Design a protein around this ligand. Structure first.
Ligand SMILES: Nc1nc2cc3nc(N)[nH]c3cc2c(=O)[nH]1
Ligand SMILES: Nc1nc2cc3nc(N)[nH]c3cc2c(=O)[nH]1
Ligand SMILES: [Zn+2]
Ligand SMILES: [Zn+2]
Lengths: 363, 363
């Protein structure tokens, strides 16, 4: 394979399906990336993550720089060999993870003390051996005034240029990894346009829509996507950071998004929430204590082939680790089945019907 | 297969190796039973427990009667289908699990309020669909005076008779399951003899040595085994309840024990302790933070094939579920490799050399 090649095999409206080819493997798009923040997708072996259909997972510069350390992981052979995942890994840059500081034009120092900057973020992502490196940005808080959103976006665009130059100055990274830029501008069309233009002038391998999934709510998120995604280069992947619930994913693909991540299937699975095609259920509810059906009636995952709602109910109520394992495997497999149904429906020219059907039943 | 058949294929001294055949499968002896107290071997799918080599797992009447309930499990199709383990299951009777009350000759009531008795224990084990049912006994506290140990043992022997009659009165249970008696008598030879005699007069499919692994320490435990195991019928399995550390298992097999259980590999694995042929290690120790070796240098388990000490160190320090999963799978696989080396060495007439070699290196 090449360092990076995105090809679009079929289209319907603004939706696209295709493939990203990288040295460590092929990513089918639209893609959902399970989140592996501490060098693990919580409660799953990497072979189980792959068996659900994932082609790529997400890691985080911020978390891994703190524990176990980026230089440590490099000394141990990089993130892929450390955790036993040999396929592509995308790493976020630390520009969100303000969520968990002294800010300046140079970067951010935060509470031991640590520092991140465009140069240091890109370096950490190199030490980890990331395949898709995210530019170092500022996720603008929501809501933001137009002035604050503009200042923040402008700084992020200067940081995007510094990110590009830091990545390109490291020959091994430039030859083997890809770099994505992150659009900012909050909910304001003109600032989203200025940001898209800045990013396309610099030039990246892919373009993320940043600054969403920060409390704005679906209607607003969709309105911003309606004008923001068309601003990005059409021939590169479009990544919506941190999204989301199954309905959010379907509507975002209808608006031109190719890549997704979120902790909802893993985190809410450990808390008892199971996704089904008839909507989410909370397995802790006493109504499931003698329910012999699988979590979902159609799901092909190994959990639904083997165990009942009643058993998983018991495990979660008892605080047993196997309950977290089973709930997480099912929810990640559900998300991957959703992405496969989206890909196949776009490929067959029937995605808009799929999206309507999905919603009618899920709600 | 038959309901129950124990065959001894080879002997060395007091040690034996062979097989127990039951309707749900064959158990290779000497056997280690992973503990699955809440209807799960903690942090392992049943297929992973089987892949480590286990032939049988242990469940507990006390815990399962409280959560999810014995009648509930029966309504759901029994413990095997509930948890997805289709091989034999031994259940303890609740006579230990005083550890976690109003006692009388009729049984014990304990804190909601619950009751156990010989009749109710055997009934619960039937509702669960246990393959090896334990008689309802009193595990005598340690230390005990000879008078208190005698009173307690005598009550247990009356309860053993009631257990036998309750099991035999239930045709489906009598035809499909096995019943083991439990010897008591604390550390006193004459009371152990009286108990063995009582149990052999009643007649059981197997005989447990109860009342040990309750704080007495290895030397004392071994002294009691030295005289107690020969008192039991030679042609039936001998089960030492709750034992134990790898060295305890080796010395108990040298004294005629065929079956073992304990929470040490699962519980101490979640707490960071890994078994190796050079003795246990605590993976949380900072000396492992950049150690690329597997947990154990010779272990054939999937954990040792794929992940380093450094990674597992990270996971346990971070409180990640995958650390508990990996540590537990390795420790259970280590225990099963120990039992396989014991079986093969007895079969080859070189168990005493194995035991000496094991100890020289483990210590
Ligand atoms: N670097 C970066 N990461 C992000 C991660 C996110 N997760 C959610 N929910 N929203 C996010 C936005 C950003 C963002 O704007 N920048
Ligand atoms: N029913 C029964 N169960 C037991 C379980 C045990 N676990 C350890 N550590 N010792 C034990 C003794 C008994 C015992 O004497 N009776
Ligand atoms: Zn499923
Ligand atoms: Zn191992």
């Amino acid at each position: 394979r090449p360092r990076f090649s995105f090809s679009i095999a079929a289209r319907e409206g603004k939706a696209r399906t295709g493939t990203i080819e990288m040295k460590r493997g092929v990513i089918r798009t639209p893609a959902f990336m399970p989140v592996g923040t501490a060098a693990t997708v919580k409660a799953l072996k990497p072979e189980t993550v792959r068996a659900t259909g994932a082609d790529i997972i997400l890691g985080n510069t911020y978390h891994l720089m703190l524990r176990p350390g980026a230089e440590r992981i490099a000394k141990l052979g990089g993130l892929h060999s450390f955790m036993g995942w040999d396929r592509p890994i995308l790493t976020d840059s630390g520009g969100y993870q303000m969520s968990l500081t002294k800010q300046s034009e140079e970067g951010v120092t935060f509470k031991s003390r640590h520092m991140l900057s465009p140069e240091r973020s890109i370096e950490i992502q190199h030490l980890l051996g990331s395949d898709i490196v995210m530019a170092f940005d500022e996720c603008t808080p929501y809501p933001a005034t137009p002035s604050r959103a503009a200042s923040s976006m402008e700084r992020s665009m200067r940081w995007a240029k510094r990110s590009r130059d830091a990545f390109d100055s490291r020959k091994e990274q430039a030859e083997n990894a890809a770099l994505f830029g992150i659009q900012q501008g909050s909910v304001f069309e003109n600032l989203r346009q200025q940001s898209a233009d800045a990013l396309a002038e610099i030039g990246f391998d892919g373009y993320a829509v940043g600054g969403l999934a920060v409390g704005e709510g679906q209607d607003e998120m969709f309105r911003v996507l309606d004008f923001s995604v068309p601003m990005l280069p059409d021939d590169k992947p479009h990544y919506l950071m941190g999204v989301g619930k199954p309905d959010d994913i379907v509507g975002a693909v209808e608006r031109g998004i190719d890549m997704f991540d979120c902790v909802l299937p893993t985190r809410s699975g450990r808390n008892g929430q199971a996704f089904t095609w008839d909507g989410p259920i909370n397995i802790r509810n006493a109504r499931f204590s003698e329910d012999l059906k699988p979590l979902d009636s159609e799901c092909h995952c190994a959990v639904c082939q083997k165990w009942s709602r009643a058993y998983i109910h018991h495990l979660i109520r008892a605080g047993e680790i196997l309950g977290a394992m089973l709930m997480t495997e099912h929810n990640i497999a559900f998300y991957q089945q959703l992405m496969q149904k989206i890909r196949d429906s776009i490929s067959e020219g029937r995605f808009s019907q799929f999206a309507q059907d999905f919603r009618a039943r899920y709600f």
